[PDB]
């Protein structure tokens, strides 16, 4: 489907913006993976934003590794609105009391109370459920995000569950529960040049292509001579296409 | 889902049957690229039937290929009866007036008659249709389907299009639409030791597993102690596995 070789595209590095943070630790084992393979496995997934520029979607750590690998082009492949919806990762915390970070943060102004305001942030274990709000906080919405997000993330250990999934906790488990944001959000963020915390944006996206396996080598120089390059590449991989419209599982390993 | 990992399994090679027939053309294709890599791909999708037989739903190819190799067990995704629907291909034949195959068979009781009785086959164009009925018909539907589908499908161009699928037929197009049948009948068939023809049931499954890439080495010697290799490997691809939940567009290359 012609269609989807016209979305894949190389973009200048310089050219594509992030609208989250990243954990380095995933950057650098991505990165490792992508320098042994000497290949991405799949496109970074962007939308057109303004400017000529472009914003990731999905993929950061990857799109992260190729920008520290020394990459002046990145293969993306191109969304448009209508094939992505945006929810959110909660975050689920094992053993979520061995986690010193998030551990004592008293301050922030908690509440087991429950309003029809928006609760910004939720904190769940097996029993109980707390709230943030910023009719209680001093701070704007964001930072708080970047706070909370940021004591346990880096040091304690997480497992990200889609927002609309089905989910019990244990009673060791801490689950930090986050509200989806709107593009207008997200797009407001990135033309301020600011980010949301990481891995908490989840956007649902149909047709992304699988398995493009772009050799590291296209991506070093741009002269449109790769780029000539880059379209035989594609080419050949094209024919290799097959869509599938149900629910698969996918092993992604050779 | 880790249920994955229990429907797949190696089954001896003279426990499994087809339900419909092959084309050697496409047969020696799969064949020769199964030998070059020396893996399989994607496991065979079968359902359990009766007397600990399986009945292939999906890669009758694949599993020829196999057989025709000399492996005495074949990789396989047992499919579930939640996991699946069954539907039909419809075969359009553009400028079929041309196609002299279905043209000079003048005996068919071909007739635009509409019956209360559900035809065998029914042969649109643009603005008219023809049936055949059981009444007008000596011989069982499945030789019918047979006689009628091998007259023209050496013979012309024929684009398989879901029986679901929207098709809005252009001047000059025929249209040949099968009856989908019922698992009951699929079985029913699979006993007698007959076959549906090629190309005419279309199972839609959700959940397969792709790209498991199963080495050959693995299904020459049907072992116990063969058995512990195949689970090894298995729970290393596992550990590569991922869902998708949406319409994936996947390289199948590498």
């Given at each position: 489907m012609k269609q989807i070789y016209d979305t894949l595209q190389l973009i200048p590095v310089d050219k594509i913006d992030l609208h989250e943070a990243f954990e380095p630790s995933?950057?650098?084992?991505?990165?490792?993976s992508?320098?042994?393979?000497?290949?991405?496995?799949?496109?970074?997934?962007?939308?057109?934003?303004?400017?000529?520029?472009?914003?990731?979607?999905?993929?950061?750590?990857?799109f992260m590794s190729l920008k520290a690998l020394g990459?002046?082009?990145?293969?993306?492949q191109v969304?448009?609105?209508?094939?992505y919806s945006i929810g959110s990762w909660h975050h689920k915390i094992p053993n979520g009391a061995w986690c010193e970070g998030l551990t004592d943060e008293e301050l922030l102004p908690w509440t087991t109370e429950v309003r029809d305001e928006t609760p910004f942030i939720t904190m769940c274990d097996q029993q109980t459920e707390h709230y943030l709000?910023?009719?209680?906080?001093?701070?704007?919405?964001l930072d708080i995000w970047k706070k909370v997000v940021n004591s346990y993330s880096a040091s304690?250990?997480?497992?990200?569950?889609?927002?609309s999934a089905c989910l019990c906790l244990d009673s060791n488990d801490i689950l930090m529960k986050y509200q989806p944001l709107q593009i207008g959000e997200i797009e407001?963020?990135?033309?301020?040049?600011?980010?949301?915390?990481?891995?908490?944006?989840?956007?649902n996206i149909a047709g992304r292509c699988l398995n493009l396996q772009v050799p590291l080598h296209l991506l070093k120089n741009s002269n449109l001579g790769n780029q000539?390059?880059?379209?035989?590449?594609?080419?050949?991989?094209?024919?290799?296409?097959?869509?599938?419209t149900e629910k698969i599982y996918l092993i992604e390993a050779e």
């Open positions: 995933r950057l650098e084992k991505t990165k490792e992508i320098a042994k393979e000497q290949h991405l496995r799949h496109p970074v997934l962007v939308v057109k934003t303004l400017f000529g520029r472009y914003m990731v979607i999905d993929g950061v750590h990857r990459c002046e082009v990145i293969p993306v969304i448009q609105r209508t094939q709000y910023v009719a209680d906080l001093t701070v704007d919405k304690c250990n997480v497992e990200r569950v889609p927002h407001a963020v990135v033309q301020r040049g600011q980010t949301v915390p990481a891995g908490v944006t989840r956007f000539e390059q880059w379209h035989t590449f594609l080419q050949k991989k094209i024919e290799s296409m097959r869509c599938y």
